[PDB]
Design a protein around this ligand. Structure first.
Ligand SMILES: COc1cc(OC)c(-n2c(=O)cc(C(F)(F)F)[nH]c2=O)cc1Cl
Ligand SMILES: COc1cc(OC)c(-n2c(=O)cc(C(F)(F)F)[nH]c2=O)cc1Cl
Ligand SMILES: *Cc1c(COP(=O)(O)O)cnc(C)c1O
Ligand SMILES: *Cc1c(COP(=O)(O)O)cnc(C)c1O
Lengths: 365, 365
């Protein structure tokens, strides 16, 4: 055991710098900054000194376990250029907690979370001009941890690479205003199972998801509604946690989300939304199981107000439509404002871009 | 939608050749040959011309979907230097069928199966001296298909690499004659689920498996017994299909294996063993569900003869012991010969090394 340390950072500035993109015409994860973080690991010598250096291709042995046995995990967090032109990270300690936990579950070697965060701060600081000059755009931070074991043996890797990429991203839909998603619901496909890795951000979870995603796009849907179990539990909306704002069976007004029972990725946005709803104390907040039957029963009873997905990329993604067993189930999210969705988006946006102070934000070192 | 063609092969021989290893001191997937196959793909231009060239590191964009979203699959088949010094592939068309099917499920681009097989034949032919001069050793062939999409966008990859590695491998256990495995049975972990990709050889299935494998090694076990469902179905023995030779509940002598209901990798060895057992017609052959309760009930009734795993790496791996609910359940496989296990290994070995003729073997082009 041990860790790489930020104070040992070897910075190799780029001699040639790239023109930044137009913040208004940005496709997600397409454009990359001048520099990246890389840290080598071996079982023999442990963590090498971390490097900030020019963005380059990785030279990987073709037997690298990341390519064969998906010995890999990632994270998604953002840096935001605020209204006061100060750059802020948003709850980055929750990403470090989740990446550590993912590393343990992948059997990739542990590291000091404070040392990674500080290494990421230095990377964003070097490339701080890539944090878009726009109140509707952000720098996407992609920490990645891959096994580079050069053997086809299925085992704990004896070699690993931890690297970070920065990618400037614009608003979720390039129109800026709310574009509601249609969800493809086919229970033939299952994202995660009890005793699986669904509650970790491990690459394996996404490779298996990709067929259903393409099947969704074919039928005019943007995301997959992930169903689980005999009773068709609604779990996640694609790459996002699932929120339902409704009148519940007891007749109380309720914000409901599936509980962290192993098949749900504990999202940062999900945490923040639950924290806000609790704090406001205006309606019942329930981590509880939701079925398609629960949802359709409520729809014919006009009890559904809003449904939305939460995640680092979209923050709040309203749901208008679900395609399930060949019928098109409409969700009246956009006909109800969407009131709660708009309030959450505005609250999180205000915090991220420094319009109000919060413990959730850290100004860049 | 098209394909690369064997007749377009661009061969770049190596100017410096490596010394072959001692077949008696070979760890699995550790040592690699002089050359590899590489074929580039793009959505724009389609399949580039295939290349046989010196074994080298892959230069990959750090955003490659194989590293982030485990957009990857592999295969495992062998070349065998026979008793007549002719090199044979073993049912390689089943590997091509299974790799194609896996490519469709991963949303990686399709290819002509005959053209891949012929490209692999040419690769093995160039490196044919790496096929060990040993009747107990083989050349492991690792076709690999990875998404090289340089964007963090979760979608069908617009760029891919299909590459093949050759690795000389020794006998299954390095002490030659049968060394039985002890299995770690902990139902907390689940390899595959209904609606998953367990019946495909996609990297994601193995990344998730790795924690249970390390937990097994900790408790002196070599493989994991993968349990599924309320009733604890025995599904696979680690990276191998599960065979049970026993007296069944009706008192008939039976060779039983879990059925291809979505959570079982349809193994080539599994297919061949079922085909042989059917052909012999000496006992009942049942693709049917096996539970830990079924197994323990049969053990206390002295109805269990042999249990073994099947797969390209081991062929037949006898099981002596299962660690389950803290106790050590002994399996009398080694006290019963193992009769059937030894007969299967000898039949498959005879076919692979050309001691008897079979439709299952192809002599190298
Ligand atoms: C040292 O004991 C072993 C343990 C193994 O897994 C735990 C394997 N093994 C396979 O059986 C199959 C594959 C795969 F997936 F490539 F087919 N890869 C492997 O490492 C081989 C040996 Cl010799
Ligand atoms: C509107 O089109 C999109 C569709 C998406 O999922 C298909 C995503 N998307 C990612 O691509 C990656 C992640 C992550 F980071 F979790 F992997 N989360 C996301 O929502 C982003 C956009 Cl902009
Ligand atoms: C990343 C992710 C989320 C949302 O996590 P955030 O930290 O809010 O971005 C939800 N579901 C899955 C499957 C995810 O991978
Ligand atoms: C590869 C594999 C097998 C065996 O397949 P073969 O073609 O016989 O090598 C069995 N189970 C799993 C999970 C596998 O990945």
């Amino acid at each position: 055991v041990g860790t790489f340390k930020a104070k040992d950072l070897i910075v190799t500035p780029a001699t040639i710098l790239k023109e930044k993109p137009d913040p208004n015409n940005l496709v997600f994860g397409t454009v990359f900054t001048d520099h990246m973080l890389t840290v080598e690991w071996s079982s023999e010598f442990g963590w090498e000194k971390p490097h900030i250096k020019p963005l380059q291709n990785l030279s990987l042995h073709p037997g690298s376990s990341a390519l064969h046995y998906a010995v890999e995990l990632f994270e998604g967090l953002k840096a935001f250029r605020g209204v006061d032109n100060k750059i802020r990270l948003f709850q980055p300690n929750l990403n470090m907690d989740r990446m550590y936990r993912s590393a343990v579950r992948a059997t990739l070697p542990v590291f000091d979370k404070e040392e990674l965060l500080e290494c990421i701060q230095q990377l964003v600081k070097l490339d701080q001009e890539w944090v878009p000059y726009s109140t509707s755009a952000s720098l996407y931070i992609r920490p990645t941890f891959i096994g580079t074991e050069p053997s086809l043996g299925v085992k704990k890797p004896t070699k690993a690479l931890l690297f970070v990429l920065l990618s400037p991203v614009g608003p979720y839909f390039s129109s800026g205003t709310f574009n509601p998603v249609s969800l493809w619901a086919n229970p033939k496909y299952v994202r995660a199972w009890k005793g699986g890795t669904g509650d970790c951000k491990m690459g394996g979870n996404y490779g298996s998801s990709l067929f259903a995603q393409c099947e969704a796009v074919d039928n005019g849907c943007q995301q997959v509604l992930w169903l689980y179990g005999e009773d068709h539990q609604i779990t996640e909306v694609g790459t996002m946690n699932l929120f339902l704002y409704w009148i519940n069976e007891d007749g109380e007004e309720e914000l409901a989300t599936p509980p962290l029972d192993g098949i749900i990725l504990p999202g940062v946005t999900r945490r923040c939304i639950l924290d806000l709803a609790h704090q406001w104390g205006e309606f019942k907040v329930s981590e509880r199981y939701l079925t398609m039957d629960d949802l359709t029963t409520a729809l014919e009873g006009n009890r559904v107000r809003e449904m939305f997905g939460s995640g680092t990329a979209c923050v709040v993604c309203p749901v208008s439509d679900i395609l399930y067993k060949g019928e098109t189930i409409h969700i009246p999210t956009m006909e109800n404002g969407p009131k709660l969705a708009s309030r959450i988006l505005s609250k999180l946006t205000d915090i991220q871009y420094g319009r109000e102070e919060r413990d959730w934000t850290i100004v860049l070192s």
